[PDB]
Tab-separated table of N, CA and C and ligand atoms in Angstrom:
chain	number	residue	atom	x	y	z
D	1	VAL	N	-2.943	-8.680	17.098
D	1	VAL	CA	-3.206	-7.910	16.102
D	1	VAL	C	-2.402	-6.306	15.651
D	2	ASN	N	-2.018	-6.072	15.013
D	2	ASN	CA	-1.210	-5.023	14.967
D	2	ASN	C	0.063	-5.488	15.733
D	3	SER	N	0.916	-5.736	15.551
D	3	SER	CA	2.293	-6.153	16.292
D	3	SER	C	3.859	-5.891	15.560
D	4	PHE	N	2.987	-5.117	15.118
D	4	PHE	CA	4.683	-4.423	14.305
D	4	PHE	C	5.565	-4.346	14.671
D	5	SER	N	6.854	-5.567	14.502
D	5	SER	CA	7.934	-5.108	15.044
D	5	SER	C	9.099	-4.270	13.527
D	6	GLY	N	10.410	-3.610	14.761
D	6	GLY	CA	11.354	-3.303	14.722
D	6	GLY	C	11.281	-2.002	12.670
D	7	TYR	N	10.159	-1.825	13.232
D	7	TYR	CA	10.345	-0.666	12.450
D	7	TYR	C	10.358	1.284	12.548
D	8	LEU	N	11.234	1.096	11.840
D	8	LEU	CA	11.502	2.603	11.364
D	8	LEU	C	11.016	4.385	11.822
D	9	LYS	N	11.532	4.215	12.637
D	9	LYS	CA	9.929	5.943	12.948
D	9	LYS	C	10.639	6.821	12.330
D	10	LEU	N	9.339	7.196	10.894
D	10	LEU	CA	10.043	8.343	10.404
D	10	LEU	C	9.823	9.690	10.835
D	11	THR	N	8.156	10.344	11.216
D	11	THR	CA	7.998	11.183	11.430
D	11	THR	C	6.551	10.400	12.688
D	12	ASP	N	6.327	10.785	12.906
D	12	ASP	CA	4.947	10.885	14.516
D	12	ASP	C	4.251	9.488	13.539
D	13	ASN	N	3.798	9.684	12.181
D	13	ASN	CA	2.825	8.465	11.874
D	13	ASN	C	3.106	8.152	10.650
D	14	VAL	N	4.488	7.682	10.550
D	14	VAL	CA	4.922	7.403	9.505
D	14	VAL	C	5.867	6.489	9.602
D	15	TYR	N	6.209	4.752	9.207
D	15	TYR	CA	7.280	3.358	9.965
D	15	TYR	C	7.494	3.106	8.095
D	16	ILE	N	9.024	2.768	8.968
D	16	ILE	CA	9.655	1.721	7.409
D	16	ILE	C	10.343	0.999	8.173
D	17	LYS	N	10.590	-0.562	7.068
D	17	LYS	CA	10.885	-1.553	7.363
D	17	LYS	C	11.446	-2.380	6.138
D	18	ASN	N	12.642	-3.135	6.259
D	18	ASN	CA	13.149	-3.578	4.952
D	18	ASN	C	11.937	-4.907	4.948
D	19	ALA	N	11.568	-5.764	4.281
D	19	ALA	CA	10.630	-6.689	4.757
D	19	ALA	C	9.980	-6.740	3.209
D	20	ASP	N	9.261	-8.332	3.356
D	20	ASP	CA	8.289	-8.734	2.861
D	20	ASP	C	6.784	-8.467	3.004
D	21	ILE	N	5.861	-6.924	1.772
D	21	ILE	CA	4.685	-7.263	2.890
D	21	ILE	C	4.218	-7.689	2.843
D	22	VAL	N	4.055	-9.538	2.185
D	22	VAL	CA	3.138	-10.376	2.194
D	22	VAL	C	3.697	-11.198	4.009
D	23	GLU	N	4.876	-11.311	3.809
D	23	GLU	CA	5.923	-12.744	5.482
D	23	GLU	C	5.423	-11.006	6.968
D	24	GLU	N	5.064	-10.148	6.482
D	24	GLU	CA	5.162	-8.609	7.457
D	24	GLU	C	3.075	-8.820	7.894
D	25	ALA	N	2.392	-8.745	6.667
D	25	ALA	CA	1.171	-9.610	7.276
D	25	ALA	C	0.789	-10.778	7.768
D	26	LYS	N	1.416	-11.731	7.335
D	26	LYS	CA	1.244	-13.177	7.702
D	26	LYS	C	2.226	-12.895	9.778
D	27	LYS	N	2.822	-12.248	9.941
D	27	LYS	CA	3.919	-12.021	11.417
D	27	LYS	C	2.733	-10.457	12.601
D	28	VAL	N	2.386	-9.779	11.032
D	28	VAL	CA	1.629	-8.181	12.414
D	28	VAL	C	0.203	-8.831	12.673
D	29	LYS	N	-0.551	-10.031	11.982
D	29	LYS	CA	-1.631	-9.885	11.402
D	29	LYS	C	-2.331	-8.939	12.112
D	30	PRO	N	-1.950	-7.761	10.655
D	30	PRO	CA	-3.126	-5.827	10.675
D	30	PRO	C	-4.064	-5.653	10.169
D	31	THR	N	-5.309	-5.233	11.125
D	31	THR	CA	-6.193	-4.472	10.804
D	31	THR	C	-6.504	-4.527	9.269
D	32	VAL	N	-5.506	-4.313	8.734
D	32	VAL	CA	-5.958	-3.392	7.441
D	32	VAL	C	-4.527	-3.601	6.383
D	33	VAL	N	-3.855	-4.023	5.231
D	33	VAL	CA	-3.240	-4.392	4.706
D	33	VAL	C	-3.278	-3.709	2.882
D	34	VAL	N	-2.606	-2.536	2.909
D	34	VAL	CA	-3.241	-1.968	1.680
D	34	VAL	C	-2.541	-2.609	0.690
D	35	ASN	N	-3.437	-2.946	-0.565
D	35	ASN	CA	-2.890	-2.960	-1.561
D	35	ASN	C	-2.427	-2.590	-3.014
D	36	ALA	N	-2.260	-2.533	-3.328
D	36	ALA	CA	-1.489	-1.772	-4.283
D	36	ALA	C	-2.137	-1.986	-5.966
D	37	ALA	N	-3.460	-1.273	-5.691
D	37	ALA	CA	-4.210	-2.139	-6.544
D	37	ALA	C	-4.663	-1.059	-7.710
D	38	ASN	N	-4.723	-1.527	-9.007
D	38	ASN	CA	-5.412	-0.811	-10.341
D	38	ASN	C	-7.273	-0.560	-10.618
D	39	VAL	N	-7.427	-0.111	-11.528
D	39	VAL	CA	-8.833	0.182	-11.103
D	39	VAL	C	-9.787	-1.315	-11.546
D	40	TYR	N	-9.244	-1.779	-13.076
D	40	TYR	CA	-10.386	-3.124	-12.167
D	40	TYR	C	-9.440	-4.287	-11.205
D	41	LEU	N	-8.708	-3.979	-10.392
D	41	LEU	CA	-8.420	-4.935	-9.629
D	41	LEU	C	-8.509	-5.989	-10.543
D	42	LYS	N	-7.562	-6.849	-10.922
D	42	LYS	CA	-7.064	-7.627	-11.313
D	42	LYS	C	-5.317	-7.517	-11.052
D	43	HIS	N	-4.938	-8.324	-10.609
D	43	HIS	CA	-3.850	-8.540	-9.450
D	43	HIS	C	-2.838	-9.948	-9.701
D	44	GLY	N	-2.762	-9.422	-11.134
D	44	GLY	CA	-1.542	-10.562	-11.518
D	44	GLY	C	-0.308	-9.970	-11.541
D	45	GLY	N	0.349	-8.885	-11.334
D	45	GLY	CA	1.517	-8.747	-11.474
D	45	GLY	C	1.704	-7.288	-9.481
D	46	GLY	N	2.902	-7.027	-9.602
D	46	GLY	CA	3.752	-6.592	-8.509
D	46	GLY	C	2.997	-6.772	-7.281
D	47	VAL	N	2.616	-5.549	-5.927
D	47	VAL	CA	2.233	-5.866	-5.297
D	47	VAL	C	0.516	-7.035	-5.014
D	48	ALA	N	0.230	-6.795	-5.914
D	48	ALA	CA	-1.231	-7.188	-6.157
D	48	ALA	C	-1.247	-8.977	-5.781
D	49	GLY	N	-0.442	-8.904	-6.625
D	49	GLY	CA	0.193	-10.056	-7.553
D	49	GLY	C	0.482	-11.066	-6.400
D	50	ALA	N	1.821	-10.972	-5.009
D	50	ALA	CA	2.161	-11.499	-4.301
D	50	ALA	C	1.308	-11.189	-3.753
D	51	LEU	N	0.135	-10.476	-3.257
D	51	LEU	CA	-1.084	-10.174	-1.766
D	51	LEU	C	-2.259	-12.234	-2.111
D	52	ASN	N	-3.096	-11.868	-3.332
D	52	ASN	CA	-3.343	-12.730	-4.303
D	52	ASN	C	-2.508	-13.967	-4.602
D	53	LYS	N	-2.267	-14.680	-4.328
D	53	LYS	CA	-0.957	-15.522	-4.443
D	53	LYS	C	-1.269	-15.411	-3.224
D	54	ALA	N	-0.650	-15.507	-1.792
D	54	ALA	CA	-1.131	-15.619	0.190
D	54	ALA	C	-1.943	-16.082	-0.173
D	55	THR	N	-3.102	-15.511	-1.055
D	55	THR	CA	-4.423	-15.793	-0.425
D	55	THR	C	-4.843	-16.810	-1.299
D	56	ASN	N	-4.493	-17.400	-2.341
D	56	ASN	CA	-4.098	-18.951	-2.483
D	56	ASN	C	-5.567	-18.111	-3.324
D	57	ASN	N	-5.741	-17.291	-4.252
D	57	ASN	CA	-6.649	-16.460	-5.295
D	57	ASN	C	-7.872	-16.294	-4.763
D	58	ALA	N	-8.290	-16.902	-3.273
D	58	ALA	CA	-9.078	-15.680	-3.103
D	58	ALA	C	-9.808	-14.414	-3.598
D	59	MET	N	-8.145	-13.918	-2.979
D	59	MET	CA	-8.636	-12.601	-3.432
D	59	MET	C	-8.978	-11.779	-4.366
D	60	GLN	N	-8.748	-12.799	-5.738
D	60	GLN	CA	-8.689	-12.399	-7.079
D	60	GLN	C	-9.908	-12.666	-6.768
D	61	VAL	N	-11.263	-14.041	-6.471
D	61	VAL	CA	-12.350	-14.525	-6.470
D	61	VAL	C	-12.780	-13.442	-6.611
D	62	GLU	N	-13.021	-13.032	-5.259
D	62	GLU	CA	-13.658	-11.522	-4.587
D	62	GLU	C	-13.426	-10.449	-5.273
D	63	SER	N	-12.870	-10.131	-5.807
D	63	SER	CA	-12.361	-8.694	-6.726
D	63	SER	C	-13.413	-9.266	-8.238
D	64	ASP	N	-13.556	-9.533	-8.559
D	64	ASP	CA	-13.661	-9.970	-9.561
D	64	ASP	C	-15.460	-10.587	-9.923
D	65	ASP	N	-15.386	-10.946	-8.554
D	65	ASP	CA	-17.656	-10.862	-8.256
D	65	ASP	C	-17.527	-9.336	-8.226
D	66	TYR	N	-16.944	-8.191	-6.868
D	66	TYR	CA	-16.627	-7.296	-7.303
D	66	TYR	C	-16.928	-6.498	-8.179
D	67	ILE	N	-16.078	-6.069	-9.280
D	67	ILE	CA	-16.012	-5.864	-10.522
D	67	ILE	C	-17.153	-5.723	-11.404
D	68	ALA	N	-17.459	-7.229	-11.722
D	68	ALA	CA	-18.441	-7.493	-12.396
D	68	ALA	C	-19.777	-7.059	-11.986
D	69	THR	N	-20.472	-6.565	-10.575
D	69	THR	CA	-21.462	-5.809	-10.365
D	69	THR	C	-21.540	-4.280	-9.411
D	70	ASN	N	-19.991	-3.661	-9.922
D	70	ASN	CA	-19.360	-2.362	-9.381
D	70	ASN	C	-18.946	-1.690	-9.829
D	71	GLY	N	-18.749	-2.200	-11.466
D	71	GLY	CA	-17.761	-0.790	-11.962
D	71	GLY	C	-16.471	-1.014	-11.332
D	72	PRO	N	-15.197	0.113	-12.153
D	72	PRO	CA	-13.936	-0.203	-11.626
D	72	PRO	C	-13.940	1.117	-10.246
D	73	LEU	N	-12.613	0.981	-10.384
D	73	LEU	CA	-12.416	2.135	-9.427
D	73	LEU	C	-12.145	3.289	-10.194
D	74	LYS	N	-12.008	4.529	-9.402
D	74	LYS	CA	-10.488	5.447	-10.149
D	74	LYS	C	-9.742	5.591	-9.958
D	75	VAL	N	-9.060	6.461	-10.997
D	75	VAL	CA	-7.703	6.282	-10.416
D	75	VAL	C	-7.535	7.073	-9.314
D	76	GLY	N	-7.195	7.555	-8.598
D	76	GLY	CA	-6.253	8.088	-7.263
D	76	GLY	C	-7.297	7.413	-5.521
D	77	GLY	N	-8.272	6.566	-6.273
D	77	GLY	CA	-9.891	6.076	-5.094
D	77	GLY	C	-9.105	4.544	-4.370
D	78	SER	N	-9.826	3.648	-4.035
D	78	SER	CA	-10.085	2.637	-2.909
D	78	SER	C	-11.089	2.356	-3.063
D	79	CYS	N	-11.326	0.331	-2.599
D	79	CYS	CA	-11.983	0.187	-1.733
D	79	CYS	C	-11.672	-0.637	-1.254
D	80	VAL	N	-12.593	-1.081	0.489
D	80	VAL	CA	-12.525	-1.823	0.826
D	80	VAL	C	-12.928	-3.184	0.751
D	81	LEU	N	-12.122	-4.274	0.630
D	81	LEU	CA	-12.545	-5.187	0.541
D	81	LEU	C	-11.953	-6.369	1.580
D	82	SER	N	-12.696	-7.732	1.407
D	82	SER	CA	-12.100	-8.719	2.720
D	82	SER	C	-10.191	-8.589	2.950
D	83	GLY	N	-9.293	-8.906	4.209
D	83	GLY	CA	-7.812	-9.330	3.591
D	83	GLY	C	-8.007	-10.964	4.169
D	84	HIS	N	-8.923	-11.063	4.022
D	84	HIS	CA	-8.635	-12.596	3.588
D	84	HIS	C	-7.851	-13.748	5.101
D	85	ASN	N	-6.746	-13.842	5.022
D	85	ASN	CA	-6.118	-14.357	5.670
D	85	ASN	C	-4.933	-13.563	5.923
D	86	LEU	N	-4.560	-12.723	5.150
D	86	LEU	CA	-3.718	-11.450	5.469
D	86	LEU	C	-4.460	-10.698	6.398
D	87	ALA	N	-5.692	-10.328	6.425
D	87	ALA	CA	-5.736	-9.011	7.216
D	87	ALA	C	-7.357	-8.566	7.576
D	88	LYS	N	-7.812	-7.703	8.363
D	88	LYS	CA	-9.202	-7.834	9.279
D	88	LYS	C	-9.863	-8.005	7.647
D	89	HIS	N	-9.516	-6.363	6.716
D	89	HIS	CA	-9.718	-5.830	5.970
D	89	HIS	C	-8.475	-5.782	5.009
D	90	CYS	N	-8.370	-5.538	3.314
D	90	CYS	CA	-7.982	-5.070	2.915
D	90	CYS	C	-8.315	-3.577	1.819
D	91	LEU	N	-7.350	-2.538	2.052
D	91	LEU	CA	-7.532	-1.260	1.768
D	91	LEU	C	-7.117	-1.609	0.409
D	92	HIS	N	-8.144	-1.194	-1.092
D	92	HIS	CA	-7.400	-1.867	-2.511
D	92	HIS	C	-7.471	0.098	-2.410
D	93	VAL	N	-5.392	0.646	-2.768
D	93	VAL	CA	-5.846	1.943	-3.241
D	93	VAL	C	-5.003	1.791	-4.616
D	94	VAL	N	-6.039	2.618	-5.800
D	94	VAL	CA	-5.312	2.932	-7.230
D	94	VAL	C	-4.495	3.713	-6.848
D	95	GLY	N	-3.073	3.959	-7.520
D	95	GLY	CA	-2.307	5.356	-7.554
D	95	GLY	C	-2.061	5.215	-8.786
D	96	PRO	N	-1.843	6.294	-9.441
D	96	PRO	CA	-1.785	7.274	-11.355
D	96	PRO	C	-0.407	5.384	-11.266
D	97	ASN	N	-0.892	5.055	-12.483
D	97	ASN	CA	-0.093	4.199	-13.319
D	97	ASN	C	0.956	5.219	-13.967
D	98	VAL	N	2.461	6.099	-14.101
D	98	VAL	CA	3.394	7.585	-14.835
D	98	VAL	C	3.206	6.804	-15.876
D	99	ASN	N	3.821	5.227	-15.359
D	99	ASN	CA	4.319	4.519	-16.845
D	99	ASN	C	3.255	4.244	-18.119
D	100	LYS	N	2.230	4.521	-17.609
D	100	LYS	CA	1.243	4.913	-18.589
D	100	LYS	C	0.553	6.486	-19.028
D	101	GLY	N	0.822	7.218	-18.822
D	101	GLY	CA	0.665	8.502	-18.124
D	101	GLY	C	-0.244	8.965	-17.541
D	102	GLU	N	-0.805	8.577	-15.737
D	102	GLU	CA	-1.279	8.735	-15.482
D	102	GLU	C	-0.801	9.974	-14.358
D	103	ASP	N	-1.606	10.791	-13.609
D	103	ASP	CA	-1.312	11.932	-13.143
D	103	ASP	C	-0.943	11.652	-11.637
D	104	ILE	N	0.264	12.104	-12.044
D	104	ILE	CA	1.187	12.377	-10.726
D	104	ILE	C	1.018	12.582	-9.551
D	105	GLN	N	-0.267	13.691	-9.656
D	105	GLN	CA	-0.752	14.457	-9.350
D	105	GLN	C	-2.062	13.748	-8.537
D	106	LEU	N	-1.974	12.366	-8.579
D	106	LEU	CA	-3.223	11.884	-7.719
D	106	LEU	C	-2.763	11.387	-7.158
D	107	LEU	N	-1.401	10.406	-7.111
D	107	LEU	CA	-0.674	10.444	-5.887
D	107	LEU	C	-1.385	10.688	-4.430
D	108	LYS	N	-1.958	11.836	-4.673
D	108	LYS	CA	-1.610	12.361	-3.269
D	108	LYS	C	-3.384	12.516	-2.665
D	109	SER	N	-4.600	11.797	-3.866
D	109	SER	CA	-5.553	11.886	-3.436
D	109	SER	C	-5.451	9.899	-3.329
D	110	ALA	N	-4.986	8.731	-3.330
D	110	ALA	CA	-4.681	7.352	-3.282
D	110	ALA	C	-3.606	7.457	-1.962
D	111	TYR	N	-3.260	8.375	-1.680
D	111	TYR	CA	-3.108	7.586	0.327
D	111	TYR	C	-3.616	8.535	0.682
D	112	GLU	N	-4.486	9.673	0.226
D	112	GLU	CA	-5.922	10.311	1.100
D	112	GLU	C	-6.473	9.317	1.911
D	113	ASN	N	-6.440	8.089	1.043
D	113	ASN	CA	-8.103	6.763	1.054
D	113	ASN	C	-6.854	6.597	2.514
D	114	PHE	N	-5.853	6.797	2.631
D	114	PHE	CA	-5.056	5.534	3.977
D	114	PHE	C	-5.833	6.332	5.261
D	115	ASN	N	-6.746	7.688	5.223
D	115	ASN	CA	-6.913	8.466	6.789
D	115	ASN	C	-8.144	7.937	7.148
D	116	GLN	N	-8.835	6.916	6.787
D	116	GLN	CA	-10.201	6.221	6.857
D	116	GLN	C	-9.831	4.865	8.434
D	117	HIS	N	-8.705	4.704	8.119
D	117	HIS	CA	-8.016	3.969	9.063
D	117	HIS	C	-7.141	3.488	9.957
D	118	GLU	N	-7.171	3.556	11.320
D	118	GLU	CA	-6.380	3.960	11.956
D	118	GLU	C	-4.865	3.837	11.661
D	119	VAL	N	-4.421	2.933	11.536
D	119	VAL	CA	-3.396	2.066	11.358
D	119	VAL	C	-3.852	0.978	9.970
D	120	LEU	N	-2.320	1.110	9.073
D	120	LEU	CA	-2.743	0.755	7.587
D	120	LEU	C	-0.713	-0.190	7.917
D	121	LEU	N	-0.985	-1.681	6.961
D	121	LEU	CA	0.551	-2.047	6.829
D	121	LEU	C	0.447	-2.398	5.219
D	122	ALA	N	1.134	-0.709	4.450
D	122	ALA	CA	0.934	-0.420	3.624
D	122	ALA	C	1.823	-0.494	2.452
D	123	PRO	N	2.379	-0.893	1.456
D	123	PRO	CA	3.527	-0.519	0.249
D	123	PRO	C	3.459	1.210	0.042
D	124	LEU	N	4.807	1.066	-0.655
D	124	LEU	CA	4.853	2.558	-1.869
D	124	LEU	C	3.948	2.917	-2.458
D	125	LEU	N	2.726	3.332	-1.961
D	125	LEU	CA	2.076	3.561	-3.945
D	125	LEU	C	2.843	4.422	-5.390
D	126	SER	N	2.358	4.116	-6.258
D	126	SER	CA	2.134	4.001	-7.407
D	126	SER	C	3.778	3.085	-7.033
D	127	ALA	N	4.913	2.675	-6.555
D	127	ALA	CA	6.609	1.888	-7.142
D	127	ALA	C	6.045	1.127	-7.791
D	128	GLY	N	6.990	0.862	-8.836
D	128	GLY	CA	7.145	-0.982	-9.490
D	128	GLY	C	6.953	-0.590	-10.690
D	129	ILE	N	5.879	-1.305	-10.759
D	129	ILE	CA	4.480	-1.272	-12.834
D	129	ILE	C	3.967	0.363	-12.625
D	130	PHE	N	3.821	0.464	-11.055
D	130	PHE	CA	3.156	1.703	-11.780
D	130	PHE	C	4.051	3.170	-12.195
D	131	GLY	N	5.692	2.399	-11.645
D	131	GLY	CA	7.307	4.253	-12.192
D	131	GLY	C	7.280	4.942	-11.913
D	132	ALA	N	6.740	5.750	-10.897
D	132	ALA	CA	6.671	6.833	-9.729
D	132	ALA	C	7.916	6.405	-9.199
D	133	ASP	N	8.018	7.509	-8.938
D	133	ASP	CA	9.907	7.577	-8.587
D	133	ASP	C	9.382	7.727	-6.578
D	134	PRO	N	10.294	6.373	-6.461
D	134	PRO	CA	9.588	6.127	-5.027
D	134	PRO	C	10.290	7.302	-3.395
D	135	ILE	N	11.432	8.001	-3.901
D	135	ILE	CA	11.376	9.069	-2.455
D	135	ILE	C	10.137	10.336	-3.541
D	136	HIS	N	10.015	10.749	-3.860
D	136	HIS	CA	8.723	11.077	-3.879
D	136	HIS	C	7.139	10.564	-3.799
D	137	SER	N	7.152	9.287	-4.061
D	137	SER	CA	5.965	8.595	-3.294
D	137	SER	C	5.758	9.457	-1.585
D	138	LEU	N	7.297	8.509	-1.218
D	138	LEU	CA	6.964	9.056	0.654
D	138	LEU	C	6.614	9.881	0.773
D	139	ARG	N	7.310	10.801	0.145
D	139	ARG	CA	6.760	12.368	0.601
D	139	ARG	C	5.707	12.344	0.369
D	140	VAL	N	5.175	12.169	-0.240
D	140	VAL	CA	3.400	12.031	-0.841
D	140	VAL	C	2.878	11.840	0.495
D	141	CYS	N	3.303	11.035	1.383
D	141	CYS	CA	2.680	9.815	2.267
D	141	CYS	C	2.966	10.168	3.105
D	142	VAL	N	4.396	11.351	3.586
D	142	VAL	CA	4.334	12.085	4.911
D	142	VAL	C	3.656	12.867	4.837
D	143	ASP	N	3.263	13.676	3.437
D	143	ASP	CA	2.926	15.297	4.193
D	143	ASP	C	0.965	15.043	3.975
D	144	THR	N	0.002	13.856	3.440
D	144	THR	CA	-0.898	13.535	3.058
D	144	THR	C	-1.354	12.572	5.074
D	145	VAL	N	-1.460	11.238	4.663
D	145	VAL	CA	-1.488	10.303	5.854
D	145	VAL	C	-1.528	10.744	7.210
D	146	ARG	N	-2.819	10.925	7.903
D	146	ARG	CA	-2.476	10.911	9.615
D	146	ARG	C	-3.112	10.514	10.674
D	147	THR	N	-3.340	9.160	10.076
D	147	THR	CA	-3.211	7.728	10.616
D	147	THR	C	-2.057	7.311	10.555
D	148	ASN	N	-2.153	5.816	11.540
D	148	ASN	CA	-0.577	5.425	10.942
D	148	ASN	C	-0.350	4.085	10.363
D	149	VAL	N	0.565	4.279	9.444
D	149	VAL	CA	1.167	3.863	8.114
D	149	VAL	C	3.002	3.309	8.188
D	150	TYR	N	2.171	2.043	8.811
D	150	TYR	CA	3.678	1.242	8.304
D	150	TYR	C	4.327	0.280	7.338
D	151	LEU	N	4.714	0.620	6.769
D	151	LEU	CA	5.460	0.718	4.866
D	151	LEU	C	6.606	-0.314	4.746
D	152	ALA	N	6.391	-1.110	4.912
D	152	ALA	CA	7.197	-2.323	3.647
D	152	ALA	C	7.899	-2.160	2.670
D	153	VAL	N	9.354	-1.759	2.254
D	153	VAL	CA	10.152	-1.508	1.318
D	153	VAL	C	10.862	-3.784	1.258
D	154	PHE	N	11.035	-4.416	0.242
D	154	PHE	CA	11.587	-5.167	0.337
D	154	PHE	C	12.586	-5.327	-0.787
D	155	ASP	N	12.956	-4.960	-1.219
D	155	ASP	CA	14.801	-4.465	-2.417
D	155	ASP	C	15.114	-3.463	-1.123
D	156	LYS	N	16.608	-3.725	-0.729
D	156	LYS	CA	16.564	-3.511	0.741
D	156	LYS	C	18.304	-1.555	0.019
D	157	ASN	N	18.088	-1.736	-1.280
D	157	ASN	CA	18.854	-0.874	-2.133
D	157	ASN	C	17.952	0.426	-2.122
D	158	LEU	N	16.647	0.062	-1.959
D	158	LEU	CA	15.612	0.611	-2.417
D	158	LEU	C	15.303	1.688	-0.425
D	159	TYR	N	15.128	0.428	0.067
D	159	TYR	CA	14.710	1.393	1.180
D	159	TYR	C	16.164	2.068	1.634
D	160	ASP	N	17.209	1.398	1.275
D	160	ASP	CA	18.507	2.429	1.937
D	160	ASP	C	18.486	3.762	1.938
D	161	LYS	N	18.106	3.437	-0.175
D	161	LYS	CA	17.752	5.419	-0.521
D	161	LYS	C	17.133	5.889	0.262
D	162	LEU	N	15.811	5.287	0.860
D	162	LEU	CA	14.880	5.804	0.766
D	162	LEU	C	14.907	6.300	1.936
D	163	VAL	N	15.281	5.817	3.014
D	163	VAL	CA	15.668	6.403	4.487
D	163	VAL	C	16.342	7.969	4.005
D	164	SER	N	17.542	7.222	3.142
D	164	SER	CA	18.895	7.938	3.044
D	164	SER	C	18.467	9.612	3.326
D	165	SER	N	17.317	9.842	2.112
D	165	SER	CA	16.779	10.519	1.064
D	165	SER	C	15.901	11.590	2.053
D	166	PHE	N	15.179	10.490	3.251
D	166	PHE	CA	13.857	11.259	3.898
D	166	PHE	C	15.022	12.032	5.345
D	167	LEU	N	15.806	11.603	5.681
D	167	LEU	CA	16.908	11.878	6.873
D	167	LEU	C	17.208	12.961	6.304
D	168	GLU	N	17.751	13.464	5.031
D	168	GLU	CA	18.104	14.793	4.203
D	168	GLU	C	17.770	15.968	5.117
B	201	LIG	CL1	12.372	4.355	15.674
């Protein structure tokens, strides 16, 4: 388990790779994979949809059962559900959706969820459909997360921008 290879160490506890999170989960066998969740755990798009498709919809079936009994998450919150075939656990984390007017401040709360897990495979929170500046997201990750985080960024141009930004 947790066989991370070819990462670039940014800080003592934050690592980055130009890779697909689904392919990483299959290769690494992480204890924890982070999902870029929404409050209703509806995994139709973005990273959530890629993770769910890689579980052959088992993540969505479990999520729908969870929500019907347990209610929604909060923005900046998390829950731990099964990792199915991808990981032991999936930490579903809700970053703010700034495209929909949610407070970017909540990205700090979102990343604080990572500190309950010693090592995580994760995407950049509030990227993509959530609309936040990826350079900002990496800074909040570095400033907030104290446990070991392995970030997978699949877009090569974005990866290059993040690494260039970080090394300034
Ligand atoms: Cl390195």
